Amino acid sequence: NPIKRALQGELLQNEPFIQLCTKIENYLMDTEAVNEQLIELNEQLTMRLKEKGLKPGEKGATKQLRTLIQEILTEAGFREGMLQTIGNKPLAAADFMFLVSSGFMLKDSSLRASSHGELTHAIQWCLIILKRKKDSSFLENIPTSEICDRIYKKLGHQDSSNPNYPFTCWDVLIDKLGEIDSRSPEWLSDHIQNDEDQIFPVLREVIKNR
């Protein structure tokens, strides 16, 4: 559990928390497993667009994906409504982490501007939540509605930012630039937009379309 390198204080001694993070890390490194939830997300989106008489190129498609993402997040205990700043300015890290600790999901650019994606962190969390809904053992059978409180919020606590290690627990799980798997949002964003096995064409086109 190299995750422990990023931890101090109470979180460092919190074995269930460490186990939950370890499971997430092991899942996101597993592209075979991640694809299964991306397929599911693609299928739910496809269902959604069709029901409303929408095409993936349509404007409303971008809206439909966002509302789908929010519904999944809400089910997991996140605040209802993804935040950004007016004008898409980044927040200072302390303010960003305060909002994380409070249960809010934000646009990727609210922490760091990226040319690769906009809602990639939101999507990472949706994949984690969908995995747990499929397989309860993934998150040690915690209730789905407690994912935000038991995991996400703690990523904004200072106990998950051990200053002896260059990476925070947030970094190690979902912001690990340079990795060739979904721990890196750059990698996940490119993975989706490429869709090389043609297994999420609807999710792919909608994400390109914004």
Strand partners, 106: 83
> Helix 31-51 to helix 120-134 angle, to the nearest 10 degrees?
100
What CA–CA distance (Å, rounded) separates 66 from 82?
9
3-state DSSP of the chain: CHHHHHCCHHHHCCHHHHHHHHHHHHHHCCHHHHHHHHHHHHHHHHHHHHHCCCCCCCHHHHHHHHHHHHHHHHHCCCCCCCECCHHHCCCCHHHHHHHHHCCCCECHHHCCCCCCCCCHHHHHHHHHHHHHHHCHHHHCCCCHHHHHHHCHHHHHCHHHCCCCCCCCHHHHHHCCCCCCCCCCHHHHHHHHHHCCCCCCHHHHHHHHCC
The contacts of residue 19 (CB under 8 Å, 6+ apart) are 140
Locate 56 and state its tokens. Answer: 């993936």
Listed in sequence order, the residues at least 6 apart from 144 whose beta carbon sits closer than 8 Å to its beta carbon are: 75, 76, 129, 132, 133
Interruptions in the chain after residues (C–N over 2.5 Å):
none
Cβ–Cβ contacts within 10 Å for residue 177, how many? 13
> Could you count the other beta carbons within 10 Å of the beta carbon of residue 79?
15
Angle of the 59-75 helix axis to the 201-208 helix axis, nearest 10: 110
Elucidation method: X-ray
CA distance to 62, 116, 183, 188, 204, per residue, from 169 (Å): 30, 22, 11, 18, 28
CA distance 22 to 138: 10
Say how many domains are in the chain. 1
Q: Is 35 exposed, middle or buried (0-12, 13-18, 19+ CB in 10 A)?
A: middle
Query: Distance between CA 142 and CA 18 in Å, rounded?
Result: 14
Taking Cα atoms as reference points, which of 134, 128, 82 lies closest to residue 104?
A: 82
Residue ranges making up the domain that contains 107: 1-210
